[PDB]
Amino acid sequence: MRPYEIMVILDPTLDERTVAPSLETFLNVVRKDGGKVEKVDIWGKRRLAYEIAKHAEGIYVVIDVKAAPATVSELDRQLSLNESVLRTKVMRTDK
Amino acid sequence: KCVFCAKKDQAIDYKDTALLRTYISERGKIRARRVTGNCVQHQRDIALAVKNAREVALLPFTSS
Amino acid sequence: KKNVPHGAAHIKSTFNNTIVTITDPQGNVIAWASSGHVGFKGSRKSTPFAAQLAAENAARKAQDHGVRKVDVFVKGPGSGRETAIRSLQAAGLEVGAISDVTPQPHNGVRPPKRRRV
Amino acid sequence: ALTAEQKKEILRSYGLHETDTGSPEAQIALLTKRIADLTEHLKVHKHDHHSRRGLLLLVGRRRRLIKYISQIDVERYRSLIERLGLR
Amino acid sequence: AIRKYKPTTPGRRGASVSDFAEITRSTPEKSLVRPLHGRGGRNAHGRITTRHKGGGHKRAYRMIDFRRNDKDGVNAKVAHIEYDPNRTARIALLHYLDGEKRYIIAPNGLSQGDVVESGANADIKPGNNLPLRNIPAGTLIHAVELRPGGGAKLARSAGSSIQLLGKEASYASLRMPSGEIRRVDVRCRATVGEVGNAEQANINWGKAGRMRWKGKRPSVRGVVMNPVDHPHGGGEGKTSGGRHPVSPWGKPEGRTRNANKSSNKFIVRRRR
RNA sequence: ACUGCAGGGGAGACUGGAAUUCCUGGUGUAGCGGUGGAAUGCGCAGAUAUCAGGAGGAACACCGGUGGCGAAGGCGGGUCUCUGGGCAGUAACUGACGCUGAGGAGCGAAAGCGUGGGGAGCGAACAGGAUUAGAUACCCUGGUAGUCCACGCCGUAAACGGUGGGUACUAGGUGUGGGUUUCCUUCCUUGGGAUCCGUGCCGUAGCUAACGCAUUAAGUACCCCGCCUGGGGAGUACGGCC
RNA sequence: AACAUG
Ligand SMILES: [Mg+2]
Ligand SMILES: [Mg+2]
Ligand SMILES: [Mg+2]
Ligand SMILES: [Mg+2]
Ligand SMILES: [Mg+2]
Ligand SMILES: [Mg+2]
Ligand SMILES: [Mg+2]
Ligand SMILES: [Mg+2]
Ligand SMILES: [Mg+2]
Ligand SMILES: [Mg+2]
Ligand SMILES: [Mg+2]
Ligand SMILES: [Mg+2]
Ligand SMILES: [Mg+2]
Ligand SMILES: [Mg+2]
Ligand SMILES: [Mg+2]
Ligand SMILES: [Mg+2]
Ligand SMILES: [Mg+2]
Ligand SMILES: [Mg+2]
Ligand SMILES: [Mg+2]
Ligand SMILES: [Mg+2]
Ligand SMILES: [Mg+2]
Ligand SMILES: [Mg+2]
Ligand SMILES: [Mg+2]
Ligand SMILES: [Mg+2]
Ligand SMILES: [Mg+2]
Ligand SMILES: [Mg+2]
Ligand SMILES: [Mg+2]
Ligand SMILES: [Mg+2]
Ligand SMILES: [Mg+2]
Ligand SMILES: [Mg+2]
Ligand SMILES: [Mg+2]
Ligand SMILES: [Mg+2]
Ligand SMILES: [Zn+2]
């Protein structure tokens, strides 16, 4: 179970009432395999430094997960297929 | 002379898009090593943070 | 038969020629008179005097469309690049901000081979 | 590979006296594990020549430790071939 | 997966064959089999309308599910990967959870035992069938239908795929396997992935009789006929044909597509 | 073995922005391109310019250096997955288990070869233009293979530090890369000292025909291997092997 | 631009 940190940029035409319930469907596939979720910090709207996919705004979400590598690579495959997600960035946090 | 070596355990982070506004120039380019006083290892850690911040749209690749 | 009060003056300037186009802020061309339009042929087009004649010919033709103030976007490694900005001033325009928009590849495409001249 | 606990189970089966790390039994048994763990690395990734060269160094080091144990006690050599494998 | 023979005979010198390593269960599924018979190129008038046809091994038809409209949400299990003589791809037998057997074209990477979804809530995995509205752009798809509800028609030979370029309002832009850019409706269905058995173009059939087994009957050039037989016939030695090249029915070479066919509004770009 | 540490070492998958070209649409009018000077060429059927959209390929600005890593060839967009080596400290363990290595084997830039993809830009061949006594060239406009990828073959380079490996010793001065440890340790200064492993510059003794090398030796020594024996003919013929 | 030879 390695500590990962997944950064998700969401489409700004969503609403902040359904940002955290929507990605709870994604995070439940981590929990089936022994994964652990710690910090689901949502930064909200922020001006993007350049126009990603004809949008100038976007919702930044930091996942802060801790699971097996086979399940984290399973997750961001399902995140890029979701049409609300603009970008995904997965990084390890240890050395 | 190096800020990160003097002040210990300071996190060089791609999230922290306010530490990375110093150590870049007005076009957006990564500053030289001999003008910021960094060591070799932290100049490595700064430039990777800038390359990772540019790809999450926290810093522009180029901006006049 | 138009009226656009504020426009943009794009100046491309190479080692062979200079092209001075004047647009609106959406990129629709109002007038464009370049250095071979004024009578010049061959290597005389790259001289700075051929550049400042092109900058007059595009300026006074854009003022027939009611242009009073332009923004300047220069690009290219030419010496007819600052004689053009000081020819839009001395033709009845206000030149505003000057920007270099020369394209810079990030080690992109392969250049041609070097000349054994 | 070969984490700090994964080498402990090899040393409990092939080390002589509870702290042995340097004997020919322990070093061959750790090399036989790395040679095994890296030939199944090289069934994926058939073109990793830089990693494959490091396998020839372990084969050469394991073969020299096999030759040393057969010059000093042939009965220790016979049982170690049985417990790990030759040919 | 192309086994090369050894040159034991002059007919097996350059020859090669499939390795057939993908196939489980050498026999077909008995209820999904319809009979065929040959034609030899002949229409209902009894006359040869397609030359060079006939002979050939005996064949039976495997019923392929080119619709896949009626199982949106009923999952299936790949039971076997079988040989089909009627096409160049391999076929996968699906065991749906309700109790029905079906054949589909086997995609690249749909080994035995994999679960196959269908409908608007399927996953983008090789073998799932979705409407084009639910597939993201850039995805390699196969077995695409032209009209909604009409059945898979496009990109279904072995190795072939369509890249989904984009969807604007009600139409998807497709890159067909020839380089043709076609625009079709977004309610059309398509299977995710790429058709398997992609190495069969490299098969060197070794001998004349091996292509006689497949139904291809010989082909005489027009320049060695007589002028009553072909426009290229004639001459005293061998010639080139004493005219610009034509068909056996005197038609010249050039574009044979109807220039005002109704589907010109849907074609963005012709092939290259 | 344990504890740390630095790294473009390698393979696989996904993925980012800039620029070039093309496509579609708008604005626009007569030139653009190129050179020492021109011409071929492109364009006036709407080019170049300019703005928006799209497709595709290849290489990765800044960081970046004199620096790092690798046995050599080589290696720098990002992230993840698998993986090889090195350094320092502790001295826990084994007890000479070492060095070299004829033959052999494996790796091995670029060009090239086979099958199959892909092809933006570049560009042998080729074609036109110019220059010239000529111009099978240099310069200009185009342009195929090839350059890219997957899997095999090829096994050569000024593959060079023109310096084979291992080991021990023999003044120092001076930058820089990675650790470890000491006195006022915060004298903030991340300074000086000691020591281990690199990588540069200078320089003593010594060596050298000279230029030069000089603790990273081309010095003083021991072990093992490859090679030389005037220049051409010739790294060619013939025979064999691939 | 330009320019060979003894
Ligand atoms: Mg670091
Ligand atoms: Mg009849
Ligand atoms: Mg035929
Ligand atoms: Mg005849
Ligand atoms: Mg006739
Ligand atoms: Mg004849
Ligand atoms: Mg004749
Ligand atoms: Mg690396
Ligand atoms: Mg771009
Ligand atoms: Mg193109
Ligand atoms: Mg244009
Ligand atoms: Mg990379
Ligand atoms: Mg003892
Ligand atoms: Mg050796
Ligand atoms: Mg040898
Ligand atoms: Mg090789
Ligand atoms: Mg090559
Ligand atoms: Mg080739
Ligand atoms: Mg080819
Ligand atoms: Mg010529
Ligand atoms: Mg050329
Ligand atoms: Mg050839
Ligand atoms: Mg590869
Ligand atoms: Mg070299
Ligand atoms: Mg030599
Ligand atoms: Mg020596
Ligand atoms: Mg040193
Ligand atoms: Mg010196
Ligand atoms: Mg000497
Ligand atoms: Mg001789
Ligand atoms: Mg020879
Ligand atoms: Mg011979
Ligand atoms: Zn530092």
PDB file of N, CA and C in Angstrom, chain A residues 8 10-11 14-27 40-44 59-61:
ATOM      1  N   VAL A   8      -6.882  16.232  -9.457  1.00  0.00           N
ATOM      2  CA  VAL A   8      -7.933  16.152 -10.463  1.00  0.00           C
ATOM      3  C   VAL A   8      -8.422  17.561 -10.756  1.00  0.00           C
ATOM      4  N   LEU A  10     -11.439  19.520 -12.485  1.00  0.00           N
ATOM      5  CA  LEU A  10     -12.810  19.255 -12.888  1.00  0.00           C
ATOM      6  C   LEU A  10     -13.358  20.368 -13.764  1.00  0.00           C
ATOM      7  N   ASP A  11     -14.396  20.027 -14.511  1.00  0.00           N
ATOM      8  CA  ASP A  11     -15.021  20.975 -15.418  1.00  0.00           C
ATOM      9  C   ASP A  11     -15.778  22.033 -14.625  1.00  0.00           C
ATOM     10  N   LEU A  14     -19.749  22.322 -13.507  1.00  0.00           N
ATOM     11  CA  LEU A  14     -20.350  21.547 -12.439  1.00  0.00           C
ATOM     12  C   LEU A  14     -20.704  22.462 -11.275  1.00  0.00           C
ATOM     13  N   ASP A  15     -21.396  21.901 -10.293  1.00  0.00           N
ATOM     14  CA  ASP A  15     -21.743  22.616  -9.076  1.00  0.00           C
ATOM     15  C   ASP A  15     -21.013  22.014  -7.883  1.00  0.00           C
ATOM     16  N   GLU A  16     -20.670  22.867  -6.917  1.00  0.00           N
ATOM     17  CA  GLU A  16     -19.890  22.437  -5.761  1.00  0.00           C
ATOM     18  C   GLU A  16     -20.692  21.621  -4.762  1.00  0.00           C
ATOM     19  N   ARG A  17     -21.998  21.482  -4.958  1.00  0.00           N
ATOM     20  CA  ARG A  17     -22.768  20.581  -4.117  1.00  0.00           C
ATOM     21  C   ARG A  17     -22.553  19.137  -4.527  1.00  0.00           C
ATOM     22  N   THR A  18     -22.187  18.906  -5.785  1.00  0.00           N
ATOM     23  CA  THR A  18     -22.042  17.562  -6.322  1.00  0.00           C
ATOM     24  C   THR A  18     -20.629  17.306  -6.824  1.00  0.00           C
ATOM     25  N   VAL A  19     -19.632  17.961  -6.235  1.00  0.00           N
ATOM     26  CA  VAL A  19     -18.259  17.579  -6.533  1.00  0.00           C
ATOM     27  C   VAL A  19     -17.831  16.403  -5.664  1.00  0.00           C
ATOM     28  N   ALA A  20     -18.041  16.499  -4.353  1.00  0.00           N
ATOM     29  CA  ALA A  20     -17.692  15.446  -3.407  1.00  0.00           C
ATOM     30  C   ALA A  20     -18.597  14.210  -3.480  1.00  0.00           C
ATOM     31  N   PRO A  21     -19.924  14.298  -3.700  1.00  0.00           N
ATOM     32  CA  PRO A  21     -20.662  13.045  -3.935  1.00  0.00           C
ATOM     33  C   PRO A  21     -20.341  12.363  -5.252  1.00  0.00           C
ATOM     34  N   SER A  22     -19.903  13.101  -6.278  1.00  0.00           N
ATOM     35  CA  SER A  22     -19.662  12.481  -7.580  1.00  0.00           C
ATOM     36  C   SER A  22     -18.405  11.623  -7.564  1.00  0.00           C
ATOM     37  N   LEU A  23     -17.323  12.135  -6.988  1.00  0.00           N
ATOM     38  CA  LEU A  23     -16.091  11.367  -6.910  1.00  0.00           C
ATOM     39  C   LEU A  23     -16.105  10.324  -5.804  1.00  0.00           C
ATOM     40  N   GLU A  24     -17.166  10.257  -5.002  1.00  0.00           N
ATOM     41  CA  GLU A  24     -17.260   9.191  -4.015  1.00  0.00           C
ATOM     42  C   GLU A  24     -17.520   7.851  -4.689  1.00  0.00           C
ATOM     43  N   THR A  25     -18.159   7.869  -5.859  1.00  0.00           N
ATOM     44  CA  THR A  25     -18.276   6.664  -6.668  1.00  0.00           C
ATOM     45  C   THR A  25     -16.922   6.194  -7.176  1.00  0.00           C
ATOM     46  N   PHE A  26     -16.013   7.125  -7.474  1.00  0.00           N
ATOM     47  CA  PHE A  26     -14.681   6.728  -7.916  1.00  0.00           C
ATOM     48  C   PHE A  26     -13.850   6.190  -6.761  1.00  0.00           C
ATOM     49  N   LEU A  27     -13.962   6.800  -5.583  1.00  0.00           N
ATOM     50  CA  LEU A  27     -13.128   6.393  -4.462  1.00  0.00           C
ATOM     51  C   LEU A  27     -13.589   5.099  -3.811  1.00  0.00           C
ATOM     52  N   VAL A  40      -9.504  14.701   1.130  1.00  0.00           N
ATOM     53  CA  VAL A  40     -10.230  14.900  -0.120  1.00  0.00           C
ATOM     54  C   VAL A  40     -10.445  16.408  -0.233  1.00  0.00           C
ATOM     55  N   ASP A  41      -9.383  17.155   0.070  1.00  0.00           N
ATOM     56  CA  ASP A  41      -9.355  18.610  -0.054  1.00  0.00           C
ATOM     57  C   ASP A  41      -9.801  19.069  -1.438  1.00  0.00           C
ATOM     58  N   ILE A  42     -10.766  19.985  -1.459  1.00  0.00           N
ATOM     59  CA  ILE A  42     -11.306  20.563  -2.683  1.00  0.00           C
ATOM     60  C   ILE A  42     -10.953  22.039  -2.694  1.00  0.00           C
ATOM     61  N   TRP A  43     -10.188  22.464  -3.701  1.00  0.00           N
ATOM     62  CA  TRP A  43      -9.784  23.860  -3.769  1.00  0.00           C
ATOM     63  C   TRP A  43     -10.847  24.742  -4.401  1.00  0.00           C
ATOM     64  N   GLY A  44     -11.809  24.160  -5.113  1.00  0.00           N
ATOM     65  CA  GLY A  44     -12.837  24.949  -5.763  1.00  0.00           C
ATOM     66  C   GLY A  44     -12.341  25.532  -7.073  1.00  0.00           C
ATOM     67  N   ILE A  59     -12.035  23.222 -11.341  1.00  0.00           N
ATOM     68  CA  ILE A  59     -12.140  22.854  -9.934  1.00  0.00           C
ATOM     69  C   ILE A  59     -11.001  21.901  -9.603  1.00  0.00           C
ATOM     70  N   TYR A  60     -10.157  22.281  -8.650  1.00  0.00           N
ATOM     71  CA  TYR A  60      -9.003  21.474  -8.273  1.00  0.00           C
ATOM     72  C   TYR A  60      -9.340  20.592  -7.081  1.00  0.00           C
ATOM     73  N   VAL A  61      -9.092  19.291  -7.219  1.00  0.00           N
ATOM     74  CA  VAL A  61      -9.360  18.316  -6.168  1.00  0.00           C
ATOM     75  C   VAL A  61      -8.083  17.520  -5.929  1.00  0.00           C
TER      76      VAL A  61
END
